[PDB]
């Protein structure tokens, strides 16, 4: 059977979790905001020669119950910790998300990628590349800026996340 890599979109409200997902799933992007409850997408893709399926869970950046949030997290295998480079508060918000992910998954090496979206709005930047790169290094994860609008690195983040998930599976089995 085809391997299945479960990706979870994590990050504050409005950082562009949905935009990235939809851009990746259907090569589309709309400028208008659309609050997310919880959507599940699946797609057949080729990862280094093998046909696999990627499963993405796109949820609201704002969830009332911690128990529900944990049920979202616990179902994933890899995470895309998204924050917007045009809003510093969403960058600060990443530390808690990571802590919750670690607690819930109980593993320091959980497939995780730090993602700074909205790179096409360089003019409005609020978080510096270095700030982000530093946080990633101290968390021992990679950092990558994307733009779900222009597609810059959209495929890269999902495919790289898949590769780390595929690695942990390679060893942990």
């Amino acid at each position: 059977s085809l391997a299945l890599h479960k990706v979870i979109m994590v990050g504050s409200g409005g950082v562009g979790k949905s935009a990235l997902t939809l851009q990746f799933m259907y090569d589309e992007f709309v400028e208008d905001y659309e609050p997310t409850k919880a959507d599940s997408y699946r797609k057949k893709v080729v990862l280094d020669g093998e046909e696999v399926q990627i499963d993405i869970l796109d949820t609201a950046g704002l969830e009332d119950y911690a128990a529900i949030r944990d049920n979202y997290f616990r179902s994933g295998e890899g995470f895309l910790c998204v924050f917007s480079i045009t809003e510093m508060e969403s960058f600060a918000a990443t530390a808690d998300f990571r802590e919750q992910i670690l607690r819930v998954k109980e593993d320091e090496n959980v497939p995780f990628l730090l993602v700074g979206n909205k790179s096409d709005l360089e003019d409005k930047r609020q978080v510096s590349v270095e700030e982000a790169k530093n946080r990633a290094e101290q968390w021992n994860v990679n950092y990558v800026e994307t733009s779900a609008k222009t597609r810059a690195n959209v495929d890269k983040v999902f495919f790289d996340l898949m590769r780390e998930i595929r690695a942990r599976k390679m060893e942990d089995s």
Partner: protein, 113 residues
């Protein structure tokens, strides 16, 4: 007070390989969701009943994609379950009531506390 908000039949599917499992009946009440499953066995039709508190239940909208249509998923440790509604109308109704009674459950607790 307590009351039956919504209920209906659904077909369960295994979430990872989307294989069809069995028919189930869901009963929505003001603070929990009851799912009744009837699994036939050689000499002992086994039954599985689960109650899911709405303040712990993660409801996910599964987007359509060929081997999948009109489905939504329930997430609650240690389970992940997918259910298919008879048509798009039924699926839409389930998602609306699950969302609305959860909202109602939250604001009901906000006034209290």
């Amino acid at each position: 007070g307590q009351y039956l908000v919504y209920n209906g039949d659904l077909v369960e599917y295994e979430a990872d390989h989307m294989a069809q499992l069995q028919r189930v009946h869901g009963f929505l009440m003001n603070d929990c969701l009851l799912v009744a499953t009837w699994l036939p066995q050689r000499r002992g039709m086994y039954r599985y009943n689960a109650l899911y508190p709405l303040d712990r239940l993660a409801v996910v909208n599964v987007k359509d994609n060929p081997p999948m249509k009109d489905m939504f998923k329930l997430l609650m440790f240690p389970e992940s379950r997918i259910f298919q509604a008879e048509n798009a109308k039924i699926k839409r109704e389930w998602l609306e009531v699950l969302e609305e009674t959860k909202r109602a459950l939250s604001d009901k607790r906000r006034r209290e506390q």
